[PDB]
Amino acid sequence: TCPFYKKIPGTGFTVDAFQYGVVEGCTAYFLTHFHSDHYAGLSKHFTFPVYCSEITGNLLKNKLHVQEQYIHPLPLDTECIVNGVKVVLLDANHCPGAVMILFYLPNGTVILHTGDFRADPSMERSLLADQKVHMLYLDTTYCSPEYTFPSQQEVIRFAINTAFEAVTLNPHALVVCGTYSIGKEKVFLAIADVLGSKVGMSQEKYKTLQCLNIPEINSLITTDMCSSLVHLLPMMQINFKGLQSHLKKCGGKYNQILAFRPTGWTHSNKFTRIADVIPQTKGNISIYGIPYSEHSSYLEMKRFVQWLKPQKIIPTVNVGTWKSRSTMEKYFREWKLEAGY
Ligand code: NI
């Protein structure tokens, strides 16, 4: 049974609600992005209308084989009428194809559903600037002040400088980057660009990347591992055992691996500056954990919400415990008292 925070009142609509069977009253199923916790339940046998971005719709058709007649892609930043209700899709600054949804209810209520997002000041000049929002369905993944991390630009600068240093010292080092979903593609694309290489990967991952509308992608990626000195591997193989095994397969081309694990936040963030980050090393293998986030930090979240001044907030993440829910409600009331709405 579908929970309340996935239903849009006054409509036939749900958001990211594919794992509950046929939801009573639902005439259109929105999907904010192509991450498994959100698409859970979609397959080629789905027969209701799915509304989403063009990029999400490429992935539904090619990766999950959803039939074309049930895929309804909408352009961003454009007023669209769906089943008699005005909606707008906005870039969420999450993974490729990720959106926020603005719903203009027939009674005059305006609702914003952020999906998963990384709040940015640039959102304060989208179509959000123009009008008031009564209800906010908020990605609260890192809704606590201990959650700090650097800008994505600082993290990419660290990774580029680390990779270029290592490979210039040893032209025989291979760079490996972990992945387990879409998102965070800048990590491996920025490193391959500094090294003058294409990124090498499995056929399954190449196919996924080919759905993302990234400009000049055929110039940047390949399935020919032998021609590439930046390889992608599943995240589960980014450990000393899995990397050793991989280096065996490379036919004595390389004698060292430098590997990156983009994580979200980790508690080493509460002590260490990005500049000061060091790897774990075993012999000729080094592994860096880098804090590349596609979700708001606490401070970014707070800034966005204080600017928007919603009347009510409904969290969509960390909702399963009373301690989580009570923590989040306390921060929402602080933010409202400090800003005066
Ligand atoms: Ni996500």
From Swiss-Prot:
It is found in: Nucleus. Induction: During mitosis. The mRNA encoding this protein contains an internal ribosome entry site (IRES) in its 5'-UTR. This 5'-UTR generally suppresses translation while specifically promoting expression during mitosis, when cap-dependent translation may be impaired. Expressed in brain, heart, kidney, liver, pancreas, placenta and skeletal muscle. Binds constitutively to TP53BP1. Binds CDC27, which is itself a component of the anaphase promoting complex (APC). Binds PIAS1. Belongs to the DNA repair metallo-beta-lactamase (DRMBL) family. May be required for DNA interstrand cross-link repair. Also required for checkpoint mediated cell cycle arrest in early prophase in response to mitotic spindle poisons. Possesses beta-lactamase activity, catalyzing the hydrolysis of penicillin G and nitrocefin. Exhibits no activity towards other beta-lactam antibiotic classes including cephalosporins (cefotaxime) and carbapenems (imipenem). This is DNA cross-link repair 1A protein. It comes from Homo sapiens (Human). The chain holds residues 700 to 1040 of 1040 of the full protein.
